[PDB]
Design an enzyme around this catalytic site. Structure first.
Site, mmCIF file in Angstrom:
data_model
loop_
_atom_site.group_PDB
_atom_site.id
_atom_site.type_symbol
_atom_site.label_atom_id
_atom_site.label_comp_id
_atom_site.label_asym_id
_atom_site.label_seq_id
_atom_site.Cartn_x
_atom_site.Cartn_y
_atom_site.Cartn_z
ATOM 1 N N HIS B 155 0.731 -1.148 -0.002
ATOM 2 C CA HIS B 155 -0.058 0.191 -0.026
ATOM 3 C C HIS B 155 0.665 1.130 -0.160
ATOM 4 O O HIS B 155 1.917 1.394 0.453
ATOM 5 C CB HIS B 155 -0.899 -0.115 1.479
ATOM 6 C CG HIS B 155 -2.132 -0.896 1.019
ATOM 7 N ND1 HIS B 155 -2.173 -2.182 1.324
ATOM 8 C CD2 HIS B 155 -3.490 -0.578 0.394
ATOM 9 C CE1 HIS B 155 -3.366 -2.557 1.116
ATOM 10 N NE2 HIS B 155 -4.161 -1.679 0.531
ATOM 11 N N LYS B 159 -0.810 4.723 4.512
ATOM 12 C CA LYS B 159 -1.565 3.893 5.348
ATOM 13 C C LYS B 159 -0.922 3.479 6.806
ATOM 14 O O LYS B 159 0.236 3.406 6.818
ATOM 15 C CB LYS B 159 -1.518 2.247 4.621
ATOM 16 C CG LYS B 159 -2.413 1.500 5.287
ATOM 17 C CD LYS B 159 -3.076 0.136 4.406
ATOM 18 C CE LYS B 159 -3.780 -0.523 4.938
ATOM 19 N NZ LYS B 159 -5.044 -0.099 5.514
HETATM 20 N N1 LIG Z 1 -12.451 -1.502 3.401
HETATM 21 C C1 LIG Z 1 -12.195 -0.989 2.266
HETATM 22 O O1 LIG Z 1 -12.429 -1.289 1.394
HETATM 23 C C2 LIG Z 1 -11.254 0.241 2.334
HETATM 24 C C3 LIG Z 1 -10.646 1.010 1.250
HETATM 25 C C4 LIG Z 1 -9.868 2.240 1.332
HETATM 26 C C5 LIG Z 1 -9.656 2.533 2.711
HETATM 27 N N2 LIG Z 1 -9.832 2.033 3.899
HETATM 28 C C6 LIG Z 1 -9.620 2.279 5.015
HETATM 29 O O2 LIG Z 1 -10.395 3.187 5.656
HETATM 30 C C7 LIG Z 1 -9.828 4.139 6.519
HETATM 31 C C8 LIG Z 1 -9.798 5.518 5.789
HETATM 32 O O3 LIG Z 1 -8.602 5.593 4.866
HETATM 33 P P1 LIG Z 1 -8.358 6.923 4.158
HETATM 34 O O4 LIG Z 1 -7.010 6.575 3.311
HETATM 35 O O5 LIG Z 1 -9.539 7.216 3.304
HETATM 36 O O6 LIG Z 1 -7.888 7.730 5.183
HETATM 37 P P2 LIG Z 1 -7.661 9.489 5.421
HETATM 38 O O7 LIG Z 1 -7.025 9.525 6.706
HETATM 39 O O8 LIG Z 1 -7.491 10.047 4.201
HETATM 40 O O9 LIG Z 1 -9.345 9.780 5.658
HETATM 41 C C9 LIG Z 1 -9.727 9.812 7.077
HETATM 42 C C10 LIG Z 1 -10.946 10.735 7.206
HETATM 43 O O10 LIG Z 1 -11.886 10.199 8.567
HETATM 44 C C11 LIG Z 1 -11.868 11.529 9.275
HETATM 45 N N3 LIG Z 1 -12.363 11.235 10.547
HETATM 46 C C12 LIG Z 1 -11.436 10.798 11.794
HETATM 47 N N4 LIG Z 1 -12.337 10.970 12.739
HETATM 48 C C13 LIG Z 1 -13.355 11.269 12.297
HETATM 49 C C14 LIG Z 1 -14.763 12.040 13.045
HETATM 50 N N5 LIG Z 1 -14.766 11.661 14.438
HETATM 51 N N6 LIG Z 1 -15.563 12.553 12.378
HETATM 52 C C15 LIG Z 1 -15.552 12.693 11.036
HETATM 53 N N7 LIG Z 1 -14.397 12.153 10.433
HETATM 54 C C16 LIG Z 1 -13.369 11.678 10.968
HETATM 55 C C17 LIG Z 1 -10.642 12.215 8.908
HETATM 56 O O11 LIG Z 1 -10.855 13.820 9.400
HETATM 57 C C18 LIG Z 1 -10.289 12.148 7.751
HETATM 58 O O12 LIG Z 1 -10.840 13.090 6.701
HETATM 59 C C19 LIG Z 1 -8.618 3.508 6.670
HETATM 60 O O13 LIG Z 1 -8.646 2.727 8.010
HETATM 61 C C20 LIG Z 1 -8.262 2.449 5.511
HETATM 62 O O14 LIG Z 1 -7.478 1.327 6.061
HETATM 63 C C21 LIG Z 1 -10.761 0.783 3.732
HETATM 64 O O1 LIG Z 2 -7.401 -3.298 3.364
HETATM 65 C C1 LIG Z 2 -7.012 -2.209 3.805
HETATM 66 O O2 LIG Z 2 -6.438 -2.229 5.116
HETATM 67 C C2 LIG Z 2 -6.941 -1.194 2.963
HETATM 68 C C3 LIG Z 2 -7.734 -1.029 1.770
HETATM 69 C C4 LIG Z 2 -7.254 0.011 1.441
HETATM 70 C C5 LIG Z 2 -6.465 0.839 2.241
HETATM 71 C C6 LIG Z 2 -6.003 1.969 2.369
HETATM 72 O O3 LIG Z 2 -5.992 2.788 1.224
HETATM 73 O O4 LIG Z 2 -5.409 2.483 3.224
HETATM 74 O O5 LIG Z 2 -6.429 -0.044 3.248
#
Ligand SMILES: NC(=O)c1ccc[n+]([C@@H]2O[C@H](COP(=O)([O-])OP(=O)(O)OC[C@H]3O[C@@H](n4cnc5c(N)ncnc54)[C@H](O)[C@@H]3O)[C@@H](O)[C@H]2O)c1
Ligand SMILES: O=C(O)c1ccc(C(=O)O)o1
Ligand SMILES: NC(=O)c1ccc[n+]([C@@H]2O[C@H](COP(=O)([O-])OP(=O)(O)OC[C@H]3O[C@@H](n4cnc5c(N)ncnc54)[C@H](O)[C@@H]3O)[C@@H](O)[C@H]2O)c1
Ligand SMILES: NC(=O)c1ccc[n+]([C@@H]2O[C@H](COP(=O)([O-])OP(=O)(O)OC[C@H]3O[C@@H](n4cnc5c(N)ncnc54)[C@H](O)[C@@H]3O)[C@@H](O)[C@H]2O)c1
Ligand SMILES: NC(=O)c1ccc[n+]([C@@H]2O[C@H](COP(=O)([O-])OP(=O)(O)OC[C@H]3O[C@@H](n4cnc5c(N)ncnc54)[C@H](O)[C@@H]3O)[C@@H](O)[C@H]2O)c1
Ligand SMILES: O=C(O)c1ccc(C(=O)O)o1
Ligand SMILES: O=C(O)c1ccc(C(=O)O)o1
Ligand SMILES: O=C(O)c1ccc(C(=O)O)o1
Lengths: 269, 269, 269, 269
Positions: B155, B159
């Protein structure tokens, strides 16, 4: 025509060295040792590597076959290798050393003897891996400052040390080319909440599986693009080919401590 | 018509979720949060994702917009997601959870709350990864007993959790198909002298670099051969379209813990 | 006790088949051929693989050894294999066919003869590839309609036929699972101005290099993601052990066209 | 201040060029073309790439805007690019060419016009690919004589030419470093019975799938090992930023045929 003596010719490396010297057309398999107590003493060297008869036998002491070889290829044990070195000095022979696990005292003796004797000594004889160390240097100079640098390696299930010494060798080539110390920047494990990646860290990922002879990938990653430089070892034979390559080259070279870098001409690309 | 609230609408995922909900006509972008400390509160959601004004604003607390939404889509951080779950329980809302990096205790809490609340929770919202989970099960029944099983994931540099929740999801699919518990067999770090690989361990290797959207490889390695199943994610829209798809689907449903397997009808593959 | 004749015993496969039959305790190395013009005709079979003396020699025609063997294992060349098939029919023997590069006319013949003779025929005798054929079927049902499907294979420098019979096997599994005929959709070469890719085409890319034992990748590519299913063969012993396992299994059986899927019990995965 | 005309500004590259010229403070977006029949003719260039109004419109012919620009950046199609070259010659303008898929006759014309006009032409504008061209030269001197050399490339489903201009660029670097002409040694298609690989051939394998921005691998394969040098392009902005950087650099320069190697100062690496 370079006449090669393979020390410990029954060993895992030995047997490959015999096979490799056989396949190199500029080299002749001329001699071979094993431990004196061994019963392979007397056996023909070609029959040993499953390739027909050579009219040469495994002897219990290379001293006894001095006049039929130019260069000794030695992948055995420290004490054995030091005795073979002493033979070279005494009889004006050359040596390619692959043996590892020397004490500091012993490494100092090799440096001394290499003032009188032509010696090749390298921690890896793969042509490809050494070429790769050079390419990593070039890549590091151009992209290292602004890229994320990751090293990923796969090995077979029996390997006891992680990451690989070749992976660490790639890290060092990169870190050195960038005026850094690997120990300052290296990250070997990533588990749980690690936070955001640092800018300068070199990350190591280690895979252990099956019978994998050896895969290494160094990654230079920028936003938008990445450069991946990969070595695959398919056969423990490749190291043997490199060592033979080194023996050929070492033939009629002056006294000196030489490395694969020198053999392959990495400095003058 | 399904009214969606996007938690942390300014995030990497958040902004893509907003855009994805906007593009689905069965869904309405109804609400959106950010961290209270943020100054984005009072700003319009459409302007945030570069798509014109929506007449909806980023609130600092989704509690304040409860009557405007049916389902929360939550890709933020563990504590935030647990609060949004609690809201769902108290006001009869649904949630699609994408957040990763939960502690085991926290995952147990989500299981509990999912008895009362319709919850979709998946470590990956892409079709390809969920297909891949099913393929891994097949591969594990055939080869898992006698092969070494390794999971490798890459990643982007931002991350914060390792390994990926998707990797952990692959491990669970494999372990479960072999009648094991992942926690018993998993190995997350390999540093120094590890000894010979155990037979049952599932090894995890984690790469952090650049802007990599997401790469996963599960490896089944036997002596003589290996099978590699790889997923590559190119665009966060893959996740976001899936998560919105899951929200639309969840609207109809009763309490329960659901996965993207359920959403996509992939269980009997 | 199953008495095996190895066709073209001097070949890359042949030698490994000899070694494999030797190591299987239910099988005996009973006979072995080479091309008539070859000077290996007359040599002992064990000596060819450095396996010691077997008291069996390489004949120039398996017809001459017919009473010594039950099953022929044939990894040679199309015309040779057809002649061995003829032997089986005439003298009530069985055959395990590994040979690739048959014309369609010839494959129709093998189907005909397999009504009278017990025949095992597969493009790959490894467990992993046969597992992979099954996984492909699943992937094709789920993704095949949306995705671009590409098949890429690498083999050693000596392989004379392109693309591999294993690749064609992967194409057929995929096409069949999607209610198509491979010949309708397959594209084997791409040179110059090809235009935009068609939707239904299955593209084949062939690499020829070094000593590569065999690499296959089937790619399912969508906008935003792809799924890659990859088989790596590291050692010809994977093929040879499988083919011998197929010969032992075939001994018991009546007339019919069997595949490794049959031998391994993988049909209802 | 360098005034840039973007040819085919609606295209996948064109839009990213517009965006890239916009972000470069030494450059200005001055002009932009599309195909005459296109309805994007008349549209403001800024609106096209989604970053607000510029007060410049997409014309159907750059001839009409000739006084507003110094340099044309051209990633369109061969015939279009030749017309824009002709325009440069007539009105004393410079051109950065990204277009690929020229015939041999057309490449000779570009060489001729480059005697009168300042021309940058490269098959890839990325830092990483140009670094890679240098690394390939190194690898080719050390391993090229005794290795099999294979080039494999993957691109998105809309690419109309095969193989990539970048793959051809890697072939030329390798061939040239070995004192050979690529056209002598290149093999672009492998179908049916090809026979044993020749020693000197460079094999080209072409994958067309999904939305792949661009993958290249050059393989050096020996018996026992291989070296793989791989480039991955994740974002068209890598290309566009480079092409703009080239346009800025070209502004000062006299007539001549230049490459990115020249622009980036990589010739002595
Ligand atoms: N399951 C999946 O398919 C998948 C896909 C992509 C990312 N993710 C995961 O999702 C999470 C988010 O990742 P990202 O890369 O988009 O991170 P990122 O840090 O860009 O986004 C996080 C956002 O959440 C916000 N946040 C945190 N606490 C908050 C609250 N109390 N109220 C409102 N907003 C709040 C932050 O301000 C930020 O804007 C990570 O844990 C990542 O591993 C999962
Ligand atoms: O599977 C994950 O943990 C996952 C999926 C996507 C991301 C990310 O962009 O941080 O993390
Ligand atoms: N990439 C590389 O450069 C590379 C690869 C493999 C091994 N090695 C090195 O090679 C060395 C040994 O290789 P291995 O472990 O595969 O083989 P091994 O240990 O199985 O064989 C060692 C051989 O040396 C012989 N030997 C010991 N004492 C002797 C004596 N007095 N006279 C004659 N022969 C004697 C042994 O009998 C045996 O045949 C190690 O030090 C190792 O570090 C290097
Ligand atoms: N299905 C599989 O698992 C699998 C695996 C490996 C190879 N193959 C296929 O098997 C075939 C052979 O492969 P190889 O790499 O071992 O080739 P090879 O050339 O190393 O071996 C073939 C052998 O057959 C011999 N031969 C030719 N004509 C003969 C005749 N009339 N009588 C007796 N022997 C004869 C050759 O002299 C040679 O020794 C190829 O068609 C290849 O595509 C299949
Ligand atoms: N050298 C590199 O670094 C590099 C990188 C990416 C793409 N490319 C190449 O650049 C070219 C463009 O690729 P793309 O993906 O952007 O293709 P595309 O089809 O997305 O874009 C081409 C654009 O040029 C326009 N065009 C065609 N004829 C025209 C004319 N006469 N006047 C004005 N505009 C015209 C088209 O309408 C279209 O919008 C291809 O040849 C591709 O191989 C080169
Ligand atoms: O849910 C939506 O798609 C949505 C909500 C508001 C608008 C709009 O203003 O275009 O679009
Ligand atoms: O599937 C094949 O055709 C195949 C598998 C292995 C080989 C070979 O070594 O020629 O060929
Ligand atoms: O090198 C090329 O031909 C090349 C590089 C990028 C593209 C494309 O996107 O079409 O084509």
């Amino acid at each position: 025509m370079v006449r090669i003596a393979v020390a410990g010719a029954a060993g895992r490396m030995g047997r490959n060295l015999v096979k490799a010297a056989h396949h190199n057309p500029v080299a002749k398999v001329a001699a071979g040792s094993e431990r004196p107590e061994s019963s392979l003493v007397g056996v023909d060297l070609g029959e040993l590597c499953g390739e027909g008869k050579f009219d040469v036998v495994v002897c219990d002491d290379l001293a006894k076959q001095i006049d039929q070889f130019d260069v000794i290829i030695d992948f055995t044990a420290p004490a054995s290798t030091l005795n073979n070195l002493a033979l070279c000095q005494q009889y004006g022979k050359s040596i390619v050393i692959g043996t590892t696990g020397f004490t500091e005292e012993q490494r100092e003796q090799i440096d001394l003897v290499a003032q009188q004797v032509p010696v090749v000594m390298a921690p890896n004889y793969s042509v490809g891996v050494n070429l790769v160390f050079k390419l990593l240097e070039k890549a590091a100079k151009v992209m290292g400052d602004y890229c994320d640098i990751e090293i990923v390696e796969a090995h077979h299930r029996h390997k006891v040390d992680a990451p690989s010494g070749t992976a660490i060798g790639m890290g060092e080539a990169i870190a050195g080319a960038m005026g850094n110390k690997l120990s300052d920047v290296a990250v070997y494990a990533r588990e749980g909440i690690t936070g955001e990646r640092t800018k300068d860290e070199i990350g190591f990922a280690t895979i252990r599986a099956g019978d994998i002879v050896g895969e290494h990938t160094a990654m230079f990653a920028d936003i938008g693009e990445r450069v991946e430089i990969t070595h695959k070892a398919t056969d423990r034979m490749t190291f043997a080919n490199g060592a033979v390559k080194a023996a050929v080259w070492l033939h009629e070279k002056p006294a000196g401590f030489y490395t694969m870098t020198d053999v392959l001409g990495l400095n003058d690309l």
